[PDB]
């Protein structure tokens, strides 16, 4: 129940079919900032590790980043010294079979600047890593801030009340109406 | 004020009437003159259309005074003799 | 020694609590003038700091890590 640093799933050293990447059951929602795949693809362990290192370097030691998927699915390739048709090749790499709509990385820190709605999110690390992923990506930020708590609505209502009051005083002072 | 509901503090928002009397001969009347110009500016007229502002050049010899009547109905008077940028002048002279 | 000297060591309310009071109206019946002036100063400070964070390009660590979460 306390916070923990769960160990990563291990690499399965079992030959498996190339197969197809099944679709996502539904939207994946996580508070904070998320980088979400937009098309299906299989991301290599090297690519995931590079993205993690870049995210850590950009954000800093004081901030924590969660890698949502892991490369456990084996993928094989033949040695150049083997002829055609002599069975499947040796394991060559490991991949995560990311569908469309799957979060790759996310940071759970909520945006503190609720009263500054015009300051839109900082996606610096996501921008740094996106052009290197083999998947198109979309940047998301969800902070559980609902419009019922919006401060801009109160600001607008106050401005409207002030305007109405000003027009009322101007009319009264000029005295063209009862 | 940006990203805020209520306006930045202004000492004219909740005043009903303001009258500034001052004499052109006495020194240290520039603060009174600046106040008169500000309260007669159209910017104050648009910001606080409720405000009534008046001023007078005293023929008699008396210090610069400001009388204020609040919306609640209270009345106050104050001496406004002072230096303003004359302060900066005196300081540069001192050093 | 002056009476106001005694209250200096007592910490003042931070921008978070002042915003709770004024932007959200939490306990606004007990708001004091000094509190509003402090809120007005700190709100402008935060505006300027966010503007600088957005228009920041150097490697300097002069930005508090809190503003990088905007």
């Amino acid at each position: 129940m306390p916070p923990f640093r769960f160990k990563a799933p291990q690499e399965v050293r079992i030959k498996v079919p190339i197969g197809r990447i099944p679709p996502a059951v539904g939207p994946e929602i996580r508070l904070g900032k998320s980088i979400v795949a937009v098309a299906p693809h299989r991301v290599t362990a090297e690519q995931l590790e590079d993205a993690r290192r870049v995210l850590r370097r950009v954000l800093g030691r004081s901030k924590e980043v969660h890698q949502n998927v892991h490369a456990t699915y084996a993928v094989t390739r033949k040695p150049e010294g083997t002829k055609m048709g002599q069975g499947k090749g040796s394991i060559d790499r490991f991949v995560a079979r990311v569908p469309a709509g799957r979060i790759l990385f996310h940071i759970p820190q909520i945006n503190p600047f609720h009263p500054f709605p015009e300051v839109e999110p900082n996606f610096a690390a996501f921008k740094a890593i996106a052009p290197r992923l083999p998947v198109p990506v979309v940047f998301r930020e969800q902070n559980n801030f609902f419009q019922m708590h919006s401060v801009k609505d109160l600001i607008r209502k106050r401005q409207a009340e002030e305007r109405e009051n000003r027009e009322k005083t101007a009319r009264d002072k000029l005295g063209g109406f009862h | 004020m940006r990203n805020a509901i209520f306006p930045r503090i202004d000492f004219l928002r909740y005043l009903k009437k303001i009258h500034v009397s001052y004499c052109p001969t006495r020194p240290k009347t520039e603060i009174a003159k600046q106040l008169i110009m500000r309260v007669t500016s159209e910017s104050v007229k648009k910001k606080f259309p409720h405000l009534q502002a008046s001023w007078e050049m005293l023929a008699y010899d008396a210090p610069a005074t400001v009388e204020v009547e609040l919306l609640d109905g209270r009345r106050v008077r104050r001496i406004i003799d002072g230096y303003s940028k004359a302060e900066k002048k005196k300081i540069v002279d001192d050093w | 020694y002056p009476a106001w000297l005694f209250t200096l060591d007592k910490p003042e309310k931070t921008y978070g609590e002042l915003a709770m009071t004024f932007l959200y109206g939490v306990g606004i019946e007990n708001a004091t003038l000094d509190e509003y002036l402090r809120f007005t100063r700190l709100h402008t400070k935060n505006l300027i700091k966010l503007n600088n964070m957005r228009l920041k390009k150097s490697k300097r660590s002069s930005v508090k890590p809190l503003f990088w979460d905007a």
Partner: peptide
């Protein structure tokens, strides 16, 4: 300075009244 600060101290009551009325109404 004077004058302005004293008057602002006087008017903080009405400022608070307006703030409370706004928050209560909304």
């Amino acid at each position: 300075e004077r004058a302005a600060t004293a008057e602002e101290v006087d008017r903080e009551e009405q400022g608070k009244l307006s703030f409370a009325e706004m928050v209560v109404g909304s």
